[PDB]
From TrEMBL, chain C:
Name of the protein in its database record: Apical membrane antigen 1
Similarity comment text for this entry: Belongs to the apicomplexan parasites AMA1 family.
Protein's organism: Plasmodium vivax (malaria parasite P. vivax)
Cysteines engaged in disulfide bonds, as pairs: C355-C372, C357-C374
Transmembrane intervals: none
Keyword Cell cycle: no
UniProt xrefs under Pfam families: AMA-1
GO CC, one annotated term: membrane
Subcellular location per the Swiss-Prot or TrEMBL entry: Membrane
């Protein structure tokens, strides 16, 4: 199947620079156009840029004219996006996308996405605190910046990840899980919390009673 | 910029109903594509060019329109359709998308599994103290939560985050998080997350002590 | 660097000028009675078409006799002989193509003409602006001069089942190698009038940088291309007592037999074009001149003037790439210059279009054409297939 995988997002100061990458596989990359699409925190999809087959013509809106620069390494199936003179209005989850045999200006394939946070405040590691009392449990993850962090356990149909809230500069979230009450602490439960931006992983086992 | 106006913004609907959502362009358009987006994933193509359903999509869905009025149409809603839907044009440059239409789903009005928890053992010894309370699997979404310390509501240190609607059953969940210092944690004894939902009338209390 | 032009031209104008039948023919196809001419005293209407009609002939009703046989002289009563000249000696009609080259051997410019032109040029030399129409059989290389200028005589009084002479023009298989010729058929018909059918093609309308379908058309049932070329000829531009004079061998009254005398001449306006679908076996006829071809492998573009069988398979695939690459004559490479691209959103080369999104590779295009849709067109097809400038861009043009 078609495979789009973005990478290279993180914290950037307002006015600086960053480049993105988008790995392509499961189709001849040179035969298609490639695009860039972003999504705000308000959940507003916006087209960022277009590049053609051979990289002979690029197109961009007047919201990112001059600053942004799309490009492609057809040699080893890659797409990129340079991002000069950054701003908090450019803060979004960024998606590379592909056209179709139908030529109607559609977005047929999308990658998972990569997140570009643009604030003048600086990076912070998280504070993994366990939550102990069928029975529910969880892990509080306070005092971090930027987004994202991802909590992973060890029964995921009974798992809930509460979205982060900017408390006072640093983001604060929690994540819960339900187990059979007999199977704790006899089977010891553990959550694990990655923060790619700070580039730190932490895990904690909840104590009983 | 062609301004696509999606309406309604939210669309609650029980399993079984035929429900429609609108999309309206400023200037005229040849055809309108549509996209579904579940939470924590990129939007997938749903309808290509007004009428033609995309690959893998259920035929329960449908689409129509002309010029400026376009409209995605479900024939019978299911819990797996609980998602945000976006219309998009590229018949005039630059290409533009709509704001969104969040399909919610109805359910028999279930009450939460409340469970107060104290602050962690570690947090205290070099920092403040964060008392926690979860509310898992309930419907409807609005649910008032009060944090009472010695029969007195705190209010200021509480942060409140809801989940997205679950794709399987169609319930919501919440995590209330009261914040204090280690000194002012140790000055008080009673700690309760009283929760007022439409199911009961009398509130679901959940307390502890530290003696 | 890549800006788009606002000027709205058409690359097809030169190629499609022979299918503008009102301009290039200027008279009716089925029935051709465009020019007036004195005959004895009164004024009569005769063939004036500037192009040949491939496959046309007069079907006489209730007759084993051919219309190419001579006119019925004196004792030959009931008018049941034909339309061509009396067979007096055969130094004016009929002629082999060999005997036309023998007769006009010394003349330089007559020998430079083609077989159709030579037959016509000869046939319009006999004596007013009245000349006789001709019929060139290509199979037998024969040049039949027609005495009777008429084409239809199928009125309500004297023709329905009951000596009075009935007929109409048609394209049957027996007439396919014939070529109907007025006195005005241009000697350069081969490079200015329609003959062959266009394979891998249906006629269309240029709606700002791409050839679109005609909306308003008559669907009919046609099994083969012949039945479609027959039907369209029946639908095409039409510009529509004697017994005692006929049997006396009257030179002037027989010459004006069944001719009208007051202007309902088509001048080439009518259901002259058709698109034949080979797969569906449907024939879509229409009465607006086309301004381009769509490259569709299941279609054949045909006219009432065209031949009932011959097909040019080679579509002009380079037409778009040539027009884009000529419109980069601002040089008179790209480093100092920027390029103002012309309004052409279809090309065999994808890179040449410079489309804002992925263009549509047309599966049905034999040329392997890409078609750029994601772009604001400044025109549309209104009522009566009229291409018009959109309201939004009326003031600039």
């Amino acid at each position: 199947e078609v495979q789009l995988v973005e990478s290279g997002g993180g914290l950037v100061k307002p006015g600086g620079s960053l480049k993105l990458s988008c790995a392509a596989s499961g189709f001849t990359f040179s035969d298609y156009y490639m695009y860039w699409v972003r999504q705000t925190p308000e959940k507003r999809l916006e087209w960022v840029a277009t590049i053609n087959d051979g990289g002979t013509y690029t197109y961009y809106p007047d919201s990112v004219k001059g600053r942004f620069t799309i490009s492609r390494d057809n040699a080893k199936n890659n797409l990129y996006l340079q991002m000069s003179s950054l701003k908090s209005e450019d803060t979004a989850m960024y998606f590379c996308a592909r056209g179709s045999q139908l030529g109607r200006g559609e977005f047929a394939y999308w990658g998972q996405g990569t997140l570009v946070t643009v604030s003048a405040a600086k990076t912070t590691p998280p504070s993994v605190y366990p939550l102990a009392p069928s029975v529910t449990l969880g892990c509080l993850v306070k005092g971090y910046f930027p987004e994202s962090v991802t909590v992973t356990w060890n029964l995921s149909s009974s798992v809930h990840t509460f979205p982060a809230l900017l408390q006072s500069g640093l983001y604060t979230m929690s994540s819960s899980v339900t187990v059979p009450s007999s199977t704790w602490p006899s089977q010891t439960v553990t959550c694990s919390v990655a923060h790619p931006a700070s580039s730190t992983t932490v895990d904690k086992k909840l104590e009983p009673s | 910029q062609i301004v696509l106006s999606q309406s309604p913004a939210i669309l609650s609907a029980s399993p079984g109903e035929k429900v429609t959502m609108t999309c309206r362009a400023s200037s005229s358009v040849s055809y309108m594509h549509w996209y579904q987006q579940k939470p924590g994933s990129s939007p997938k193509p749903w309808i290509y060019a007004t009428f033609n359903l995309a690959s893998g999509v259920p035929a329960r869905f449908s689409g129509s329109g002309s010029g400026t009025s376009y409209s995605l149409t479900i024939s019978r809603v299911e819990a797996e359709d609980a998602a945000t839907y976006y219309c998009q044009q590229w018949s005039s440059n630059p290409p533009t998308f709509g704001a969104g239409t969040k399909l919610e789903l109805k359910r028999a009005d279930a009450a939460p599994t409340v469970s107060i928890f104290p602050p962690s053992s570690e947090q205290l010894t070099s920092g403040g103290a964060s008392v926690v309370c979860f509310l898992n699997n309930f419907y409807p979404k609005d649910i008032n939560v009060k944090w009472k310390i010695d029969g007195s509501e705190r209010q200021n240190g509480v942060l409140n985050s809801w989940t997205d609607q679950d794709s399987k059953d169609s319930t919501y969940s919440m995590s209330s998080t009261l914040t204090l210092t280690k000194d002012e944690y140790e000055r008080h004894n009673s700690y309760t997350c009283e929760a007022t939902h439409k199911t009961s009338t009398s509130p679901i209390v959940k307390s502890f002590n530290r003696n | 660097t890549v800006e788009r032009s606002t000027r709205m031209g058409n690359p097809w104008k030169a190629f499609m000028e022979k299918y503008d039948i009102e301009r290039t023919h200027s008279s009716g196809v089925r029935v051709d009675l465009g020019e007036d001419a004195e005959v004895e005293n009164a004024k009569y209407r005769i063939p004036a078409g500037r192009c040949p009609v491939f496959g046309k002939g007069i079907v006489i009703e209730n007759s084993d006799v051919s219309f190419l046989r001579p006119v019925a002289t004196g004792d030959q009563k009931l008018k049941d002989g034909g339309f061509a000249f009396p067979n007096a000696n055969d130094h004016i009609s009929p002629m082999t193509l060999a005997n036309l080259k023998e007769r006009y051997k010394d003349n330089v410019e007559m020998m430079k003409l083609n077989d159709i032109a030579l037959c016509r040029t000869h046939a319009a030399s006999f004596v007013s602006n009245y000349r006789h129409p001709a019929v060139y059989d290509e199979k037998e290389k024969t040049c039949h001069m027609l005495y009777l200028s008429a084409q239809e005589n199928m009125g309500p009084r004297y023709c329905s089942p009951d000596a009075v002479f009935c007929f109409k023009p048609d394209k049957d298989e027996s007439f396919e190698n014939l070529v109907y010729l007025s006195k005005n058929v241009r000697n350069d018909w081969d490079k200015k009038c329609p003959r062959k059918n266009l394979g891998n093609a249906k006629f269309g309308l240029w709606v700002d940088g791409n050839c679109e379908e005609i909306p308003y058309v008559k669907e009919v049932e046609a099994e083969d291309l012949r039945e479609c070329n027959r039907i369209v000829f029946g639908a095409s531009a039409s510009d529509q007592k004697i017994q005692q004079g006929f049997r006396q061998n009257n030179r002037e009254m027989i010459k004006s037999a069944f001719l009208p005398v007051d202007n309902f001449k088509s001048k080439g306006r009518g259901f002259n074009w058709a698109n034949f679908d080979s797969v569906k076996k449907k024939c879509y006829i229409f009465n607006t001149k086309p301004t381009c071809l769509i490259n569709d492998k299941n279609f054949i573009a045909t006219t009432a003037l065209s031949h009932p069988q011959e097909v040019d398979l080679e579509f002009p695939c380079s037409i778009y790439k040539d027009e884009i690459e000529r419109e980069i004559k601002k040089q008179s490479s790209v480093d100092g210059e920027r390029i103002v691209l012309p309004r052409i959103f279809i090309s065999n080369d994808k890179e040449s279009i410079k489309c804002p999104c992925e263009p549509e590779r047309i599966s049905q295009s034999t040329c392997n054409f890409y078609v750029c849709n994601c772009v604001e067109k400044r025109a549309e097809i209104k009522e009566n297939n009229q291409v018009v400038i959109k309201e939004e861009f009326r003031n600039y043009y």
